[PDB]
Amino acid sequence: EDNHNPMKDIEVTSSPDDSIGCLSFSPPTLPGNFLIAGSWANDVRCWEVQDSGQTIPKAQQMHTGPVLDVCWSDDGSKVFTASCDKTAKMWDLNSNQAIQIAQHDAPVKTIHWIKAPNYSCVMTGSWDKTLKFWDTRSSNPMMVLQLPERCYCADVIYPMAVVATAERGLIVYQLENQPSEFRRIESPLKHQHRCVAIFKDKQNKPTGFALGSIEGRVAIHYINPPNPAKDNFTFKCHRSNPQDIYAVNGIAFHPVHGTLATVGSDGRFSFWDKDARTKLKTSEQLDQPIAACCFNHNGNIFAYASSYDWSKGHEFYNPQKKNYIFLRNAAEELKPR
Amino acid sequence: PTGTTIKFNPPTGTDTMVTNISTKHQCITAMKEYESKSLEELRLEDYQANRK
């Protein structure tokens, strides 16, 4: 039985030849929807997504190394890209021209656009143990922050910032006047950190984050909860029904309903309610890991990429296995009950 | 020794369920031989060794 697309979701055309590392949907300032993917074949691709479900390959840029993160500028004219080639790039979509904007001493694992009242920069996190900020014109960073280890996962919702490193490092950042350290948090997970996602309260204000480890477990953590011993919790996920424990590769919050999606090495995506503390859906098992997922600006679209994630090392890598991006209509299923 | 030259073997453990179960951890970085590196670090150095 063919289990490449058990949910039978929309399949993006011209999918990355190599494994897909990262996914990022255009901001609400563009009309329509555009999806960016980086891959381990060094490229970054753009597809327009219509409301009909069709996808049109738009353009493509290349690094000299695997692309590990992507994101957009607030206004939608630029795509930023973070590569294993120790560089980051700003892709001007009108001109289809990319230029370097960042230099690291190791691979760049995370990239994020910060629009603040008094400044706009891109934040890069690297395995060289720094967090840097570029103004997109100068070769010198506006700011360099020292991390406790190599940058694994990173998430930004102005004015909050969450960074996970190796050895379960977890730092929350304040961004209001200048980026600055706010709190180092003793980790709620006992295993390696892989992904992180900030969520908002009812005011649309960042109040906490979801953190995912390699150990089939996600932590839900509020920054200023009324009752920490009760309001911060973890939960098990991406396990079989002897139990197999898989890695959580990606977390994403529905921008409107505040529910969340997790995707894992087990080849399944799951939908949750961190408030009701319930599970809304678990997909059927794809025949390879789900490496990255992403919601569009209004949460009508859930993108999730089917690619090997090295979770079993090189022996289980089949380079002739094809990679897919699936699009799924999420407007109804991510609403709470 | 970079990359993933040591054979993958899911570590054994124990957990509780809601009752008492045993687990296998299907992630190469759970093995002690790899627990100081991430999946992407391991894969990049396998890629630089043309170990695809």
């Binding site: 979701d9 009909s52 939960f235 098990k236 109804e332 | -």
Partner: protein
């Protein structure tokens, strides 16, 4: 492909419309005036949003080409012995209801077919009101402000702002203003009214020009229960160059239940009562003519509401009175509550009663007239069926 099999039915999506089928024998009970009624356990919102996912949109009616159509329940051409009163589905919360005319004591499983198609009417650009010339003398004190302006896509418009004074004889709200630009035809883009209670509701609006080419315009508004002496008025008009397909003598409000669709909601002018099983060829005040070839007219069909007013369909012809044929099928009497929807007038084009539709043929026939296939012709959208089976708890821990 995406079906909804729930409580003896199955709403499937062909790609441009819905096809519905009974899954069990339907016994005809309490037959009145040749018809029986039957409730379905599905609403229009279940089919367009809650039980199906159409493309990547939050609702089928949110799609580019479906955001301009009228959802229309219509019988199938492959149902010999079964007729259905067609009707617009202009709400999403009321369960779908059928009106079946049959001689059969029962309808076998899978034989009661019907469609929900998406009707795209004739565009608003083919219709406009007409300003007739009269003998109007200038008022000694001018009453309002008239500013030329651009509207729509860089088109010539006219912003009139003026108080309306109530005539004591007619009750109509009138005003005389001096238009800076001359025009024969027009469309009404909005009417903002400001009384003593504030925002105020309008039934019709006419504009007359004078026959001495002076540029004097007489505004007349017929209102709903507004008893005020003066209304403050703001009216934006589109000025229409050259003839359109339909020419009206008076403007009507946009449809409240189908916003941004081009159709006329027909309300009950005079309050009347209907005994069960009784018909009524109600005559509406509306009239129109042609300004210019396939033929053009209006479909007169019913709407959807919790207590449906069933309408035997008719074609409304240029120069002919608008009759709305009501057919009481309820067990109680029906009084025609004022300002509520009786029928819709949908403008279509056709080539030459019993409105049926063929799924394979892409053919929709009203009587002997053939509705233009383009009207119900939309692109195929791949939609999936939403299940929502289980919501089990997290198995969660704390520190």
């Amino acid at each position: 492909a995406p079906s909804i099999i729930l409580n003896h039915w199955c709403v499937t999506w062909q790609g441009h419309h819905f096809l519905c089928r009974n899954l069990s024998n339907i016994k005809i009970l309490n037959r009145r005036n040749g018809y029986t009624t039957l409730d379905l356990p599905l609403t229009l919102g279940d089919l367009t949003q809650y039980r199906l996912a159409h493309g990547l949109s939050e609702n089928l009616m949110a799609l580019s080409p479906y955001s301009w159509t009228i959802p229309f329940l219509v019988s199938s051409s492959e149902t010999p012995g079964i007729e259905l009163l067609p009707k617009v589905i202009n709400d999403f919360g009321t369960p779908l209801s059928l009106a079946i005319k049959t001689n059969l004591p029962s309808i076998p499983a899978h034989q009661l077919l019907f469609y929900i198609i998406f009707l795209r009417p004739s565009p608003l650009t083919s219709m406009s009101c007409y300003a007739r010339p009269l003998s109007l003398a200038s008022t000694p004190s001018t009453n309002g402000l008239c500013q030329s302006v651009s509207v729509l896509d860089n088109k010539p418009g006219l912003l009139i702002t003026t108080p309306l004074h109530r005539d004591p004889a007619s009750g109509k709200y009138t005003s005389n203003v001096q238009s800076p630009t001359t025009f024969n035809l027009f469309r009404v883009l909005y009417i903002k009214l400001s009384g003593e209670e504030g925002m105020v509701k309008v039934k019709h609006l006419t504009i007359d020009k004078d026959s001495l080419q002076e540029g004097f315009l007489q505004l007349c508004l017929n209102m709903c229960g507004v008893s005020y002496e003066t209304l403050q008025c703001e009216i934006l008009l589109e000025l229409v160059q050259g003839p359109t397909n339909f020419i009206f003598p008076a403007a009507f409000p946009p449809p409240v239940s189908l916003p941004h669709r081009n159709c006329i909601e027909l309300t009950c002018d005079t309050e009347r009562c209907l005994k069960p099983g009784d018909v009524m060829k109600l005559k509406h005040r509306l009239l129109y003519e042609l300004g210019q070839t396939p033929q053009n007219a209006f479909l007169i069909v019913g709407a959807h509401s919790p207590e449906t007013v069933w309408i035997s369909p008719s074609l409304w012809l240029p120069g002919q009175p608008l009759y709305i044929n009501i057919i009481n099928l309820s067990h109680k009497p029906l009084l025609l509550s004022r300002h509520s929807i009786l029928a819709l007038a949908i403008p279509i084009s056709y080539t030459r009663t019993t409105i049926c539709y063929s799924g394979n043929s892409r053919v929709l026939t009203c009587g002997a007239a053939h509705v233009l296939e383009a009207h119900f012709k939309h692109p195929p959208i791949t939609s999936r069926a939403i299940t929502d089976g289980g919501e089990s708890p997290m198995e969660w821990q704390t520190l």
